[PDB]
Amino acid sequence: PSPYVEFDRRQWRALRMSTPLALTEEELVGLRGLGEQIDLLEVEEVYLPLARLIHLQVAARQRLFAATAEFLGEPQQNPDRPVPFIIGVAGSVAVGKSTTARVLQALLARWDHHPRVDLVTTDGFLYPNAELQRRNLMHRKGFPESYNRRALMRFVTSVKSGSDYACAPVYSHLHYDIIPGAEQVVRHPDILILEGLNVLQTGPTLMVSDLFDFSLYVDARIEDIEQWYVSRFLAMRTTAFADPESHAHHYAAFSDSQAVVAAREIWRTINRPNLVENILPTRPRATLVLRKDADHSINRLRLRKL
Amino acid sequence: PSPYVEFDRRQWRALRMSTPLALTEEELVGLRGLGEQIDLLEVEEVYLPLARLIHLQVAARQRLFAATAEFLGEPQQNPDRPVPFIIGVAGSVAVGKSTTARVLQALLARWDHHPRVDLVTTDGFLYPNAELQRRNLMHRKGFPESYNRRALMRFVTSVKSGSDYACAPVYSHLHYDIIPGAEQVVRHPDILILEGLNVLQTGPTLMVSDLFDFSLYVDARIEDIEQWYVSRFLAMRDSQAVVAAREIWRTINRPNLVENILPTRPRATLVLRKDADHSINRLRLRKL
């Protein structure tokens, strides 16, 4: 055996799983508001049942908190609430982590056992571009050393310790840099989804993933992800890169052919080695691995056996 | 705040717990004849309720397996049984890991929910002495690189995969080495306790602790453990013996603790700190 239960997409459809808390047409169409990539068949057939499987784990942890509190006679030392349930979402630049995380957020928010579902990306913990510069790490942006790991650990520890106030910095995805002074405040959510390139990375002592209750790694063939990466880079020329304030503004005027060259070379020298060296080795650590085919649909699900 | 709920022994004792936690003959099956190893007061005040606390987690996991299998419609690829619940037990040489593990093994096996509880020490995954010699590692016996980590991972993976047969080699403390040809077979127990110097240590990808459901670190002041190690060494075999015990502690076991074992303490679900007389004076449990 392996430590995973495995389904391909045909097997998954053949489970004929039931939606209890089922969405209407208008609620599903509402989800097209989450991002350009949203496919309602992926949502309904894959993500809805995944959300229910995760919900079972969250509810189980809430009930175990209550059973343990009552066993102990609810001492003053013991918190009154279960701490937040934290879900990591890992995977390559451009594999679809953020869309997946946003779908899970919107679906998990639908249960009254846990209506407060916050989503924090670890991009917020990247050093600013000027600070990467001063640290000699611009060429390694997205590698584990390009993050303030101390800050990231402090933030997740605060949340997992049950604090009522924890603050994270914020990255501008349009300017490709940290927003000075900006913060996202998290206040003992029911679930925290933590998304980013370093979330399952291991470390010599406590690592951030020691605070997770569940993690998902979004997977695909390296060459398919390269394609999605080049496509996204070309698409940014007239959107994100168009703003003269963007750190990537210099890219806005590249021709299609020049943009493919620039994107493939960023992939070749930064994102691909980061994936091979740092991200792909963490794939077996995740509770759930979802593989996407070339067309972005999930073709394989591997769930750790309970 | 703290990621732990913390009790000293007084506060732990003051807890008004929800079950009787009776110490009766029946409750001590599998624990007849507690050595100089542990006092029945410790068993009653500390281990009975720890066993019930862990039982809650095991039963919650079993029920989650059943809810998930019912949601999935019990397909062919889903196992028919929850996989074994794995508990790691970490801490210095001579801190009391093996006693703690054996006590929990017997107490946990009393529940009808999970009557089959195995105990495997990772000492059985040390390279044999002849191999440690080829690697120049005798003086680092018990350090991370003195174990066959690939074999240890294959074994724990096979157990957590729901296998009906996983074999571990066996170490002899009497003969100071792996026993050639001996094996310990583990056959899908409800609970596997995995005790050893290295069980919470980290590595670059999937690590053994990734497959744990719960873990304990047995802690004490380093000067107290040194006295326990010297006393055990003497009892195992005079001022000659004290010289030899102290050489091994200073050269091998103490540096291993400082460099490799103590840094893993914060990774454990539950830390139990022992005072100089071996009684637990502090328990630190991860908030649920």
Cα A263 to Cα A260: distance, rounded to the nearest angstrom: 5
**Hey, of A5, A18, A201, which one would you mutate to test binding to chain B, going by the most B CBs within 10 A of its CB?**
A5
- Ramachandran angles phi, psi of B99, nearest 5°: -60, -50
Distance spanning both ends of chain A, measured CA to CA:
14
Cα A120–chain centre separation: 8
User: Tokens representing A34?
Assistant: 């989450």
Cα A248 to Cα A2: distance, rounded to the nearest angstrom: 44
Cβ distance A249 to A241 under 8 Å? yes
Pairing of strands B4-8, B166-172: unpaired
Pairing of strands A191-195, A117-121: parallel
Minimal C-alpha gap between B268 and chain A (Å): 10
Chain B residues close to A14, C-beta within 8 Å = 75
A306/B7 touch (CB, cutoff 8 Å), yes or no: no
Residue of A nearest to B163 (CA): A1
Which residues, including other chains, have CB under 8 Å from residue A95's CB and lie 6 or more apart?
Answer: A218, A219, A220, A225, A228, A292
Cβ distance A76 to B87 under 8 Å? no
* Count of domains observed in chain A: 1
Query: Among candidates B105, B142, B102, which has minimal Cα distance to B229?
Result: B142
Strands (E), chain B: 4-8, 85-90, 117-121, 166-172, 177-186, 191-195, 214-220, 270-274, 280-286
Pairing of strands B166-172, B177-186: antiparallel
* Eight-state DSSP code of residue B119: E
Query: Around A87, how many Cα atoms within 13 Å sit in the side-chain half-sphere?
Result: 30
Cα A150 to Cα A108: distance, rounded to the nearest angstrom: 29
Q: Which of helix, strand or coil describes residue B11? A: helix
CA-only gyration radius of chain A, Å = 20
Minimal C-alpha gap between B223 and chain A (Å): 23
Place of tokens 């991370």: B144
Cα A12 to Cα B73: distance, rounded to the nearest angstrom: 11
Residue of A nearest to B161 (CA): A3
Q: Which of B57, B79, B162 sits opposite A64 (nearest CB)?
A: B57
Q: Which of helix, strand or coil describes residue B167? A: strand
A60/B82 touch (CB, cutoff 8 Å), yes or no: no
Cα B203 to Cα B176: distance, rounded to the nearest angstrom: 27
Length of chain A as a residue count = 306
Chain B residues close to A82, C-beta within 8 Å = 288
Q: Secondary structure of chain A in the HEC alphabet?
A: CCCEEEEEHHHHHHCCCCCCCCCCHHHHHHHHHHCCCCCHHHHHHHHHHHHHHHHHHHHHHHHHHHHHHHHCCCCCCCCCCCCCEEEEEECCCCCCHHHHHHHHHHHHCCCCCCCCEEEEEHHHHECCHHHHHHCCCHHHCCCHHHECHHHHHHHHHHHHCCCCCEEECCEECCCCEECCCCCEEECCCCEEEEECCCCCCCCCCCCHHHHCCEEEEEECCHHHHHHHHHHHHHHHCCCHHHCCCCCCHHHCCCCHHHHHHHHHHHHHHHHHHHHHHHHHHHHHHCCEEEEECCCCCEEEEEEECC
Residue of A nearest to B207 (CA): A285
Between chain A and chain B, how many beta carbons pairs sit less than 8 Å apart?
135
What is the domain range of residue B87? Answer: 1-288
**Hey, of B77, B165, B212, B258, which one would you mutate to test binding to chain A, going by the most A CBs within 10 A of its CB?**
B77
Place of tokens 């759930």: A288
A72/B267 touch (CB, cutoff 8 Å), yes or no: no
CA distances from A74 to A18, A104, B9, B12 (A): 37, 33, 17, 12
Residue of B nearest to A209 (CA): B210
Cα B45 to Cα B23: distance, rounded to the nearest angstrom: 9
H/E run at residue B23: none
Q: Which of A3, A52, A79 sits opposite B157 (nearest CB)?
A: A3
CATH code, B192: 3.40.50.300
Query: Among candidates B258, B236, B234, which has minimal Cα distance to B244?
Result: B234
Length of chain B as a residue count = 288
Which residues, including other chains, have CB under 8 Å from residue B175's CB and lie 6 or more apart?
Answer: none
Q: Which residues of B are annotated as a binding site for ATP?
A: 91-98
